[PDB]
Design a binder for this molecule. Structure first.
Ligand SMILES: CC(C)(O)CC(=O)NCCn1ccc2ncnc(Nc3ccc(Oc4cccc(C(F)(F)F)c4)c(Cl)c3)c21
Length: 293
């Protein structure tokens, strides 16, 4: 009945590699406590477990939950597999079939998730489109929260181009610095996955921000939507929107989406279902974690 399950190595299997780089490697696999499709991230134990418990205790439709942990020579984190992958890749791949309704609903959902994390007094520290996952095209969930602090990023690689200026200069992380990163995430979605400050070295970012330069208005965005982003990047952290306010504003916009985003052929767009999705098939072709719990 443990909220954070301690898994023996024999209780899970890595089947294929999903992704790799800095922070480790994530595999697609099965948890066999019945067979449950999972992602497995392979990156003091007493402290690591304390932090992992918080990640296992979250219960919100827009926040991923840790299902289990395996502590050996490495730390392995086990979570439900999200069969459509990350939202960044998703928007890059489906840029010709993503309409205004979907983009605005994703903004709402991410804000709901982050508001929930704020209620849990949990600062994410690494919100980005790569860290939002697609359960279905209509339902996204935030992941990878609290790794930054568990690793020790408040002390002594950092995602500079998503960080609030106070995080860069003074390693200050708050729910308001998460609002800045939220702004960058929304910008990533509205540009269908452009790289922020592309071609500009990370070492120059603080000076650029101090000069008042920001990410440019996405072609599809009305000024109303861009102003939300710009407000997320104000130097005065206390003046940035709160996630509660962002839920309200984007929910209002989602009720009349074509007023707020101007997308060529918005009306006639269609995203692949599980049966038609190459990606879903690539992953899946016996019991979903939700059904198991
Ligand atoms: C990171 C990266 C840079 O985006 C690379 C990358 O993760 N690539 C694979 C992406 N991926 C694709 C389908 C898929 N399904 C599920 N989890 C994925 N990724 C994932 C991300 C973070 C994980 O670890 C954490 C850490 C902290 C908190 C949580 C929690 F679940 F509580 F939110 C999980 C794990 Cl185990 C897996 C998935």
């Amino acid at each position: 009945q443990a909220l954070l399950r301690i898994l023996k190595e024999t209780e899970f299997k890595k089947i294929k590699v999903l992704g790799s780089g800095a922070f480790g490697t994530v595999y697609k696999g099965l948890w066999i406590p019945v067979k449950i499709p999972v992602a497995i991230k392979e990156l003091a134990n007493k402290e690591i477990l304390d932090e992992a418990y918080v990640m296992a205790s979250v219960d919100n439709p827009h926040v991923c939950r840790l299902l289990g942990i395996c502590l050996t020579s490495t730390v392995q984190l086990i979570t439900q597999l999200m069969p459509f992958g990350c939202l960044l890749d998703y928007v890059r791949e489906h840029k010709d079939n993503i309409g205004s309704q979907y983009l605005l609903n994703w903004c709402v959902q991410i804000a709901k998730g982050m508001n929930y994390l704020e209620d849990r007094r949990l600062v994410h520290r690494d919100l980005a489109a790569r860290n939002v996952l697609v359960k279905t095209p209509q339902h996204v969930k935030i992941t990878d929260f609290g790794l930054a602090k568990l690793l020790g990023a408040e002390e002594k690689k950092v995602p500079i181009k998503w960080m609030a200026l106070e995080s860069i200069l003074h390693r200050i992380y708050t729910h308001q610095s998460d609002v800045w990163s939220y702004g960058v995430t929304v910008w990533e979605l509205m540009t269908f996955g452009s790289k922020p400050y592309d071609g500009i070295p990370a070492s120059e970012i603080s000076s650029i921000l101090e000069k008042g330069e920001r990410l440019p208005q996405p072609p599809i965005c009305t000024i109303d939507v861009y102003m939300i982003m710009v407000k997320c990047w104000m130097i005065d952290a206390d003046s940035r929107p709160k996630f509660r306010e962002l839920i309200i504003e984007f929910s209002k916009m989602a009720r009349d989406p074509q007023r707020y985003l101007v997308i060529q052929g918005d009306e006639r767009m269609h995203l692949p279902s599980p049966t038609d999705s190459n990606f879903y098939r690539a992953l899946m072709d016996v019991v979903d974690a939700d059904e198991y719990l």
